[PDB]
Nucleic acid binder design. Sequence first.
DNA 1: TTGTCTAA
DNA 2: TTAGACAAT
Lengths: 147, 98, 47, 77, 210, 98
Amino acid sequence: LLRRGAFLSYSQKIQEAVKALKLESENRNGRSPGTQEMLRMWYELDEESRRKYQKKAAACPDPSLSVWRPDIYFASVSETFETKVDDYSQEWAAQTEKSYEKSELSLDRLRTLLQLKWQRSLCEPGEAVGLLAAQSIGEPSTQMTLN
Amino acid sequence: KELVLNTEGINLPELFKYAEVLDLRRLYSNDIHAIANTYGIEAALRVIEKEIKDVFAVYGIAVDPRHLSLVADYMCFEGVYKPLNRFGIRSNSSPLQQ
Amino acid sequence: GYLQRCIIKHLEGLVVQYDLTVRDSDGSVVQFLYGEDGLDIPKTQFL
Amino acid sequence: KRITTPYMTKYERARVLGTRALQIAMCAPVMVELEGETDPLLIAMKELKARKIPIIIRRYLPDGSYEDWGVDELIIT
Amino acid sequence: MDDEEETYRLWKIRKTIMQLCHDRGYLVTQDELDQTLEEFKAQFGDKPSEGRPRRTDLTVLVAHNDDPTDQMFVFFPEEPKVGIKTIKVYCQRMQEENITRALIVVQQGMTPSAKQSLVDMAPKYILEQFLQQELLINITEHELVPEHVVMTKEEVTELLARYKLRENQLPRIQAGDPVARYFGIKRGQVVKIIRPSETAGRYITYRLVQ
Amino acid sequence: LRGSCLNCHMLTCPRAVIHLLLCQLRVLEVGALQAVYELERILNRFLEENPDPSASEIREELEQYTTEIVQNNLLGSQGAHVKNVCESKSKLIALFWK
DNA sequence: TTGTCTAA
DNA sequence: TTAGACAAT
């Protein structure tokens, strides 16, 4: 939620105590003289040392099934399913720490099983999902009794 | 103890003056056109889904969210909130289906 | 009856293409993955 | 350069086994040894497990383009 | 009653503007979008009967991050209804300092002849108009509103080359949309929409501003 | 016939409208649909610059752009089976009929 | 019985 | 802005 930029992330940690110094010049065009001073520092005191463009990342990375599509590229699942797989890996290690059964598989083969079954459960091309969405809201349309 | 102004009327900028008291971040309505003209066709796309889910969920029926998301991504395809009536097939291309 | 018939005939074409994007009966792209993650409803029961 | 699913889907298997089962009927030559059935669907489905069905599939992408996959190289479930 | 009632409104619609200029790339510092309404009373006037909040001097200009030549003014006109005259007043200020983009924060409305001269000014005179009512909320803080970011033409080229796609057969978004009017988007520019879905965690869909 | 005339065989519609529709229809045959706002933008700019009935056949820039948009994407008779193209082609002709 | 389309 | 007209179960 919190907003991001190169200049804003520069301002936050470098210029608040700087513009806390005494300057009482007027608002030039409705903007504060501290902001005039900070635009001064950004415009000419920092040139080609703008590592704020890498500190603030230029975006978040895309979802793993927008970039690196899921039908070919293995282990590209949703963020919800990645969170579920990782929480179950953390819980599975805790229960398998003390469990006197076989445990023929490790965490990596467990994850490879779950990522493979995510990939194999993709809706195959040609599915005609439009009628499946037009019957799912059409066959219990007959069952919605008014009373 | 999440107090909810469960109103019965439709005026969305009426409640924007009361931002210091209401949590307007998680605002909602039944109307698709009111949020479609206030917040947007991407925020009146997640109200169609919630309203179809609530209508089917009064009667105990569980409709999966993929069907609802497919319908909401079909109706808001052109940028405005279109019906599925006789007056919505005039947009389609093949006249045999029309 | 009539409502289900109209929702059928405004959703008869939305088949899933090989590039997994839900396109209509003319190429019109509705969704880029089916159901916003790509899966199927029968095969998501043990996930 | 072919990027689709390497897995044969269900409809692929249905049409390949259908046409191959009609590519068995009308005195058409068979390429596996048979225990003696008369249903061509069993014969065509035993060549699928044999990976002996030579059919090439033109998977129509919606542009009008296609990729030529081979049933010999497609991975059945 | 315009003592506290207008101070809160002017602070709010300054905050929504200076959260909009940062949302479109312009240079907004941290303190200019975190004025705690006490420093706004320090750095502005209080009673409009005394005229100490000078709405002719609430106007601010910002520079873009890519180049400081691309600037916008944020005009706050005192006239509740705006005609041809105030548009021609402000365009003298626009042309004398060499800008092309500017936003007018009207109070009640604008005459339809002035909206016709605002749309049909010039294609090199990029001009917009916001109400004083629809800037008390900052609609991109809503939960149902996804992350909208603009799309450069090379990325449009690659995301049409992936799917074997034309621009006719892509989903649309109207230019009167308050989020497309918020980001100030012309026709043809695709926007990227990052939905906080519940089946997945994020979903990217792309819309042409038609 | 309720828009035509007896002795002169022309119609009562103004010439800016029947030039605008004549330029917009041959853009939507190619299926450009990016130019159907461009044509009304440039003809409002022209009619603001010099309003006249002397543009009898065509305006120079409306006809110039609707030749350039036909020349670019010359094989665009096949790319016009999309929903959005037949949407505008039904909407504009219904707006001219009404 | 709706819900939009057409004419005054 | 509001009454006839047109189609569906």
